[PDB]
């Protein structure tokens, strides 16, 4: 059981900057360390072999170095492309082993949310429940807050959020907040507002609808 420890565990890098990642083995595996990249929902992708040998069809951007106990992977010019999580693997003895991974996030310029609000459809509505969703599209950083308002009464504990992965082209995040109510509860009210608070927004944004 060779155990592998990567560093850092999470990391925020400005575009066109260098990313360094390190492994620490628990004994000397010398040469026998590989690096994989894994974007979400995809199988890993071999990057480096042995432990400074390049794979064919892999950017000159990536490179590795190190021996025995300490190994370093480097992306020389961070591209949006490279928003993944990085693994090292040891090939010195069975069982075969990977590190905990290193999430790398790309620290691009501040972007501002584009906000949209969607009434529940009359098909869903006719089925008893009403979902009102608020789309915060393409923003950076990830952090933001969403406040539901119904007839100006501040809603709590009936909403749920999901945040997408970092775009691989412009590197921005999207968020979805879903308010679920009873159909009866739905028409006991008239105005429904998605109030959005974020760094790129000079003042909070509210998007709403009626009827």
């Amino acid at each position: 059981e060779i155990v592998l420890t990567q560093s850092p565990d999470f990391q925020s890098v400005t575009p066109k900057e260098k990313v360094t990642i390190t492994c620490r083995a628990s004994q000397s595996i010398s040469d026998h360390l590989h690096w994989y990249q894994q974007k979400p929902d995809q199988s890993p992708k071999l990057l480096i072999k042995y432990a400074s040998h390049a794979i064919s069809g892999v950017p000159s951007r990536f490179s590795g170095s190190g021996s025995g106990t300490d190994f370093t992977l480097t992306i020389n010019s961070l591209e949006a492309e490279d928003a993944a999580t990085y693994y090292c693997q040891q090939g010195h003895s069975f069982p075969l082993t990977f590190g905990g991974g290193t999430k790398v996030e790309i620290k691009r310029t501040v972007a501002a949310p584009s906000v949209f609000i969607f009434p529940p459809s009359d098909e869903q509505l006719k089925s008893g429940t009403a979902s009102v969703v608020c789309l915060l599209n393409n923003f950076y950083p990830r952090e933001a807050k969403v406040q539901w308002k119904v007839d100006n009464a501040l809603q709590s504990g009936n909403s749920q959020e999901s945040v997408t992965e970092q775009d691989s082209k412009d590197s921005t995040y999207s968020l979805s907040s879903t308010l679920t109510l009873s159909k009866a509860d739905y028409e006991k009210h008239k105005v429904y507002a998605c109030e959005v608070t974020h760094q790129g927004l000079s003042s909070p944004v509210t998007k709403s609808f009626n009827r």
């Binding site: 026998h32 693994y87 949209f116 999901s162 979805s176």
Partner: protein, 218 residues
């Protein structure tokens, strides 16, 4: 080009035994190399499970040895995986991988997610998120699919059969209070294309054998 392709029931009950097969095409499992099974718990990292050699020789990771077996059909070019007495720890994405002597893994399958619960499969309902604008606005409009009340993971969402790719965001499923999953899929379009083009979400949930197209209109 090799091609690894795993299939297996995506929901198996706890204490039952998980069976997975990897169909391998474009290369012979008796030709060379080693054929590996690796899993990834959701949110976690890759754990190597075991393998079978081209020779037919197998080995495994301990912490699994006493409940795991691996076999093959050379006539069918597939090897298989049996994991008995399954618990929630085994909820993961499972990968086929063909390992070189390096010993690195250049080739892997897409991964299939097995989730371990006593709960029943529920096909989803699909509701539309009407476009934010009319076709005479002249800016950008957003419309989506809302896939709601399904179990288990995963569901797959494409737009217009997959011709529409740019400006599509599919949110990770969110586990609701009723222990049912739910997500949304949204797309941003030039508003002018709302009167020239029809947007359909194709929602696909194998475990319930459900394939739904929804025409999203005002």
């Amino acid at each position: 080009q090799v091609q690894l392709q795993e299939s297996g029931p995506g929901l198996v009950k706890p204490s039952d035994t998980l069976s997975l097969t990897c169909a391998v095409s474009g290369y012979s499992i008796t030709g060379g190399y080693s054929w590996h099974w690796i899993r990834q718990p959701p949110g976690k990292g890759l754990e190597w499970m075991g393998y079978i050699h081209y020779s037919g020789y197998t080995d495994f990771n301990p912490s699994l040895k006493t409940r795991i077996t691996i076999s093959r059909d050379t006539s069918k070019n597939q090897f298989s995986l049996k994991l008995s007495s399954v618990t929630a720890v085994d909820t993961a994405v499972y990968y086929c991988a063909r390992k070189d002597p390096s010993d690195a893994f250049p080739y892997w399958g897409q991964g299939t997610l097995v989730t371990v619960s006593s709960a029943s499969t529920k096909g989803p309902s699909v509701f539309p998120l009407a476009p934010s604008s009319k076709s005479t606005s002249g800016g950008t409009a957003a419309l989506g699919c809302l896939v709601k009340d399904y179990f288990p993971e995963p569901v797959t969402v494409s737009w217009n059969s997959g011709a529409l790719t740019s400006g599509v965001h599919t949110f990770p499923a969110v586990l609701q209070s009723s222990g049912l999953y739910s997500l949304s899929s949204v797309v941003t379009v030039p508003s002018s294309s709302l009167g020239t083009q029809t947007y359909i979400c194709n929602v696909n949930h194998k475990p319930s054998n459900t394939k739904v197209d929804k025409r999203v209109e005002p």
